[PDB]
Design a binder for this molecule. Structure first.
Ligand SMILES: NC(=O)c1ccc[n+]([C@@H]2O[C@H](COP(=O)([O-])OP(=O)(O)OC[C@H]3O[C@@H](n4cnc5c(N)ncnc54)[C@H](O)[C@@H]3O)[C@@H](O)[C@H]2O)c1
Ligand SMILES: NC(=O)c1ccc[n+]([C@@H]2O[C@H](COP(=O)([O-])OP(=O)(O)OC[C@H]3O[C@@H](n4cnc5c(N)ncnc54)[C@H](O)[C@@H]3O)[C@@H](O)[C@H]2O)c1
Ligand SMILES: NC(=O)c1ccc[n+]([C@@H]2O[C@H](COP(=O)([O-])OP(=O)(O)OC[C@H]3O[C@@H](n4cnc5c(N)ncnc54)[C@H](O)[C@@H]3O)[C@@H](O)[C@H]2O)c1
Ligand SMILES: NC(=O)c1ccc[n+]([C@@H]2O[C@H](COP(=O)([O-])OP(=O)(O)OC[C@H]3O[C@@H](n4cnc5c(N)ncnc54)[C@H](O)[C@@H]3O)[C@@H](O)[C@H]2O)c1
Lengths: 281, 281, 281, 281
């Protein structure tokens, strides 16, 4: 039997990166998946962002990978900011798949890059709306289905090392990610009575398009004209106690899997770094 | 002679409660004050709140108390959500008083009271807008004046025990107050280069109208028909290691004063509970 | 293929309880075991302790269980306080089993029960010597074998909820268990360069003879003449967010297994509660 | 009126450095002092230490400074490891001065410098005995006098940044200093009933002979033949968010004074860094 055999997991930001990885790993271990992603640029008139937008095709690819593990998947192209649309998608996914046992609130963005005193209200607001309020909305949408099932469940919120410590030029993201720790604790204290566990994962740098993009390469290596990942690697590695530059999506997925599984049945309220020792520094 | 002699402090939520106490204590110790408060109900059409709104007269009373210590005060009736209006008020205050050395981001609200899965988006959004984004706006408005002075300075953010641990029916407030810890850390890492310190205070229950109101008395003591503070005291006391029911505004002001003063010149990045040992439980 | 297939784990306190469970779970998942336990009363002339001593037969039983999973086990009856004897036992175990990949520093005691200001130096010293210095000695004995292997490895220290928060009448234990968090961090920063991860587990109450003994029953339920586990259960449950009285040894072993496995290859420096939400309170 | 007018403070490690500063600062603010220090080398046959020993004359110099503030002082040359001697000294001090309101458990050492896997049991044991068990003994000796006074009180334990995070080659010290956080929490939960507050201070580098010695200069600047403090400054500064190389004893004393004073009457259970932002990194 797989470690989440017979369960259903709702994963946001599932089009690519960590969210894709979570969908696929959970499916490998026996779960069917409700996979949602915006699949559009975050800001309507704007495609020229450092972090590229995801596409409908990215989400279709996630679906094909999940089906390759002989599991079912319901996909929906929906913005976690649009609560009514998100709730409709989750409602339909639970109709189709029969239950909801696991929530992985993974969807998130980067924007901005100014000091916090020079950050625009537009960048601030978008950041809070997705990375904090969107996580709230994700749990709010899924949890009535988990409660009604009467079997308990497991909720994993994606924070960051930035939910535990700060770094210059990321302050709006740090505020949001710290707020996610509050959501984890608040939901944990309210939902424990239903044998629902709530925990957060805190990745260091992860090899996804959020990290590996031209804008980010240039920010980490302003001394170079056309830096790539190999140029950024030694700078990222300085943040770690283990001598690696970043973790992989599978590393985060393996933590999510642990929390989702019955092997972590009595683990709730925890902030778990998957950070190669960043938080020891 | 005073511990903040010759300094100027910008205090939000100064109409009453802790913010009034901060303004008066800092003035007692030699600071002039830029005091801001919304001075009206939080939600335009709405006075049916458990926590009563502040008034213009409340802020005028604070001003009289500050003047009683032979210090100057500039007051403004402004909502911390309205960044342009807040910035204009602070700009005018610094014109009048000559400098800005201390920021105390104290303004905050309570609302709601449902479980977090049942919290309205209206209540959520108002809470984040004031208790998280309002604190960000407060620092953003004040800090250019502190940087430009070239003398360093001290920024104190008011979080809560709720910014460190959760309690049922307060989850949106907990998310905001945890976000405030992120703001503290983020501003701390960015502003240290200017010899600006950033720290947060985390009160337990404080005797102000935010705690002492009819709605709250009845909520803490549903067994009584007309409960007052004496009836709520033993319930609040159960949260503490020291056998007291709540701290007073002066207790929070004394911590603010410590952080504002040169006696805390090299203290930055700290989360300081004034909590009667709540966080030991 | 087991999650620790082909590895060797060194587990202290392996005669019963959590340590036995760790040996057996790790064996089930493919590891051979170096299992050590004092197998005698902690204090030479003294058998009438609240927590009963382990016996040689207890350790023989652990061995039979590991062999039942078709794995190899080397046992040794040794006190973790006797560094030279412990080192000799580990040296022999590694000779026999070929490598050392995982260290589980699980041996521990309770004693005392007075307030910390009334705790005897005898009780203090024994507590520190086993629960803090014995953990240090365990890692010190095993890690040269792990380093010399050149394959990286994983070290798990057993702390407690008492390594993160205090409770009356357990203060010497709390000091030791907080010291264990220091050892985890210190070894983590030093050993990361070898791709050796170091983490700590923090159990709430666990159903082992350390919890389930006549002395402890009477302490939790002084109102009863002959209390048993059922009488203690509701008191223990008040410490938790999930409505359970205690976790089982397997719950701790499943966390140890996660950290020991390649699925946690980049997780280091973490304090992981398996505490049913005790640390949310 | 001084901020600790009419109080008596018991300070260990009072011969020089931070302890001297605490004694003098508390005296300046109106407290009489029971000042203890070993005033001898730590290890009987041994003066070849990087950190120089204190002397009886150092303690006499502290006493002269306290008397210069027109306060009384009782001095004793006593090792905090010798509980019976320490208790006898405190008992006599309280006879002479009439009460005990404040305890400052400041005495501490450095030794060793190997990795934790290569640290001798001699160095380990001395470190735990003084920096952990010595702190326990200090509170144990003083606190009955505080309890019996019936006026409440304040206990400050000196930990370190090393009680919150680790650094290579300091692991035994880190274990002890983390244990001190456990003592603080344990005493906090037990003594709150008596209106006794317990808190810890966590200095970064402090300009005392523990930091400023030949051995340490050479260790921080192996590239130089005869390095002094000016050469060590930029290396220490790299650990901080504020651009300073170290704090001064007065900075720690100002935090001790705050906690000792009625201005911190409801503050208990807190870990307070005076660290120039080290813990933000
Ligand atoms: N990549 C890193 O280094 C790193 C480090 C720490 C934490 N994180 C966090 O991990 C999580 C996953 O990020 P990732 O690395 O996979 O990045 P990613 O950008 O590859 O994936 C994020 C996915 O979320 C989706 N998304 C964003 N906003 C959305 C919205 N409003 N509604 C629905 N979907 C939305 C995106 O379209 C994208 O497909 C995020 O919360 C991120 O903040 C990332
Ligand atoms: N009272 C408690 O028990 C308690 C406990 C922990 C933390 N806190 C926090 O302490 C701080 C002070 O609260 P208090 O106890 O003095 O309560 P209070 O309600 O007496 O005072 C808060 C003041 O903030 C003002 N304010 C609210 N929203 C505003 C806005 N948008 N713009 C400008 N001013 C605004 C109010 O008008 C009021 O005068 C708040 O951040 C609160 O969350 C309070
Ligand atoms: N049982 C609980 O509720 C609980 C809660 C939190 C943490 N812990 C910790 O979990 C760990 C395991 O305890 P357990 O619950 O399995 O209790 P247990 O008493 O059943 O098992 C502990 C084992 O450690 C062995 N041991 C003790 N001192 C030793 C020494 N000097 N040298 C070698 N072996 C020695 C004992 O003989 C015993 O076999 C301990 O570190 C304990 O402090 C236990
Ligand atoms: N100096 C730093 O950079 C630094 C940084 C963090 C924490 N600390 C801590 O601050 C405290 C004060 O150290 P300091 O900087 O003033 O150093 P210091 O060496 O100048 O002073 C420490 C004093 O403690 C005394 N002492 C040591 N062992 C003793 C014992 N067994 N009994 C009685 N007295 C004893 C010494 O004789 C000395 O007078 C210590 O706990 C230390 O670990 C220091």
């Amino acid at each position: 039997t797989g470690r989440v055999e017979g369960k259903v997991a709702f994963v946001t930001g599932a089009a690519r990166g960590q969210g894709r990885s979570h969908a696929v790993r959970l499916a490998q271990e026996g779960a069917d998946i409700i996979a949602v992603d915006i699949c559009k640029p975050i800001r309507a008139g704007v495609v020229d962002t450092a972090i590229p937008a995801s596409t409908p095709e990215d989400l279709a690819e996630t679906a094909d990978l999940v089906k390759g593990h002989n599991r079912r998947i319901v996909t929906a192209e929906v913005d976690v900011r649009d609560y009514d649309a998100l709730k409709a998608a989750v409602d339909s996914g639970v109709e189709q798949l029969g239950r909801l046992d696991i929530i992985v609130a993974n969807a998130g963005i980067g924007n901005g890059g100014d000091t916090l005193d020079k950050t625009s209200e537009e960048d601030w607001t978008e950041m809070i709306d997705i990375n904090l309020a969107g996580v709230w909305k994700t749990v709010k949408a899924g949890v009535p289905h988990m409660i009604a099932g009467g079997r308990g469940g497991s909720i994993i919120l994606t924070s960051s090392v930035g939910g535990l410590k700060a770094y210059p030029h990321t302050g709006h993201y740090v505020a949001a990610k710290h707020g996610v720790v509050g959501l984890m604790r608040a939901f944990g204290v309210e939902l424990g009575q239903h044998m629902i566990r709530v925990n957060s994962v805190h990745p260091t740098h992860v090899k996804t398009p959020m990290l590996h993009n031209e804008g980010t390469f240039k920010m980490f290596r302003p001394d170079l004209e056309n830096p790539g990942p190999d140029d950024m690697a030694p700078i990222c590695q300085m943040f770690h106690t283990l001598p690696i530059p970043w973790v992989e999506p599978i590393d985060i997925s393996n933590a999510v899997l642990f929390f989702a599984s019955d092997e972590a049945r009595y683990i709730t309220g925890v902030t778990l770094p998957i950070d190669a020792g960043s938080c020891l520094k």
